[PDB]
Each structure stands twice: as structure tokens, then as C-alpha cells.
Design a binder for this molecule. Sequence first.
Ligand SMILES: [Cl-]
Length: 393
Amino acid sequence: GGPYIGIVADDLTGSGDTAVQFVRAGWATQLSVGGAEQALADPAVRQAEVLAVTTHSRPLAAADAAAVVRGEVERLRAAGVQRLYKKVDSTLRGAFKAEIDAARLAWGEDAIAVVCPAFPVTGRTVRQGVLYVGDRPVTETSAATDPVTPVTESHIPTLLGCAQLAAQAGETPAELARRIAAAAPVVVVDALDDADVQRLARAIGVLGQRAVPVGSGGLAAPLARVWAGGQAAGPVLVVVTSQHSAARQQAAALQQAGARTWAPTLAQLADDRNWAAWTAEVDALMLLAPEGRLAGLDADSVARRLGELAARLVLAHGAAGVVATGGDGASAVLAALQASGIALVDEVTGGVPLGTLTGGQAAGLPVVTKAGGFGEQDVLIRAAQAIRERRFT
Ligand SMILES: [Cl-]
């Protein structure tokens, strides 16, 4: 409750663009067309999870720019904000170093400014610490002669007087996080693509409150998602009843990715002792249907049964959400939880909707449903991640 994330942007366009990315990840987000004071006095900030402000400081001189930035960062911290994102130009225009030092110092003594202004979908990347626009350093482009605030140094570590890192080939977020901490208090991190940006955002998540990302629009949605994921509780439960090959391939992929999987035979599925032993034994869990029907029962007995067990697990142990494919499975899971329907929120991808259960014993639980034959191989992985990386209120 109350403001959790503060976004400080140096111009109006950037503030609005970054803020909508948080809205799109489920965060209740408030935007000031000026500074934060106005916003924080209002009792409507009790409501808001994310507060975005503009310092209108991009064309200002260093000491004036620094001044406005330190004052807003103080107000946000005073107000209970626990994550800070500083939104800058992808192409470095502004009192870049001045604002970064002022922000980091105001945030905390142990604060780390993690600087990566990449925005890959618009062609900005960070390469051995250099801000590239397409295939050239930014100082070889029009911005070296921006009428208002030219750019005169492309190598961000030189600009800031700091260290520089790049994720290694197969590096994990946790491994990357260790190296950023070692490079405190200010470090530039490379990124060529969204995958690189997401890895960095995850590392930043691992580092928690002390980690102050400094980025452009490229870092916005990844941070919205990672910080939302930190609020997910319990495993995502995935129930796969389809015998469509697409679903079996999708299940195989989710298992490959580390989901703990119950894959019983027809005989085991009808044996409550087998269920009991698996549940005792056990960020995703998967129940995988065998082909056919349970001995002595219904043509729909396998899905009905998986639905009932999934519901038992959600109520007894808890879950961050449920993903069900295909339609047979989704119907069985909702029926077992006595859900009337799904209040829609958004989607994983078109045809794979995300909502919350309405009615019944698990009202509010995030749910994703999908037809058995639908989607690419990674779609259940993506579905589970979608649940985790959305803020629900
Ligand atoms: Cl199905």
C-alpha cells in the first residue's frame, strides 16, 4: 500500500512514456506534469503504487539540474518509495553525470546507479559502455549538434568516471547481480537487445532497494515486470489436459525450463495416494494429463480429475495463479474451484487471455486459459511468467 516505485524523468515526454509502461504491467500509476510535491500532498497518492514526475531539467545547467533532481528524490524517499527509476534520454542529452550523482546520493549511501540507456527497439544500444545509435557511436550522429544540448562523449564510463560491465554468454541474473554490486557505486552495463535489458532488469531486481536503474524507455517495462514479479507469491500452477501435439510440446518445454511436473499414468491419476505423495514432495508446478480415460469412468474423467486436484492444491498450498490448456482443462479447473467466470485483465498473447477468477473459493486468483492446439512452444513458459510479472490489486 502507498507509493512503492518512484520514476524521475528529465522531460515530459519521457515521464509519460515510462509511466504508461508501468500501467501496462498492472501498476496504479500517477503522473505529474511537474514535480512530486503537488502529487504527494494529495491523499490520492495513498492510492498510487507508482509516481512519475518530470524535472524539466534536460536543457538546464549542471548545478540547477542537480538541484531539482536531489529535491525530487528526497521527496519520493520521504514518501515511502522503495524502488527508484531514473529516466533519461537514450542518447545522453542532459546534465547526465550531474543528475545521476545527485539522485544516487539522495537515494542512499549504499545506492548503486546502474546505468544503461539502451532502447533496442529504437536502435540505441550500449556497446563496451558506448551509447550506439544504429551502427555508430552517438557522437557521430546528429546529437553532437543538437541545438539545445549537444552530446560530446559517447563512452558512458568516461562521461561518468565509472566502471563498466557486460553480461557474459550464458550469464544468469544472479551472477550478473553479483558483478554489479562489486562495481559499486556507479556502473554502466552493456545491452544490445531486449533480452540483455531484461537480464539486467532481473539483476537489478535481485539487488533490491539499493539498486537505482538509470535508463531510457528501454528499461521501463522490464523494470515494471521485475518489480511486479517480486510481489508474486507461491508457484504458478500449469494444468495441461490436451493431447494436441502443440500442448505436449509446450508442456515438454515448460518441464525443460524447470517446472516440477506430475505426469501420472491413467492408473496413477485415479489413485489419490499417488497425488498425495507428489503434493507432499513439492517457479512453476505442472500437472500433465495422460491420454485416455480413467478406468471405469467418464470420457472426460481425466480432465475432470486434474481439475479437481489442481483446485485442491491451489486452496491448500496457495498459488500465484493457474494456467490451463486446453478448453476441457480450463472448464474442469474453473468448475472445481466453483468459479463463475474470469474478470479480464489483459493477455499473454492474442488468444491466451489473462484475468482473475470471479466467484467461488479462489476469487481473485490470476488465471490464463488457452486452447490446446494454440501457440508456439514457449507459450506456457510465457503464460506463467505473465502472471508473475503483472501487478494485481
Ligand atoms: Cl483439450
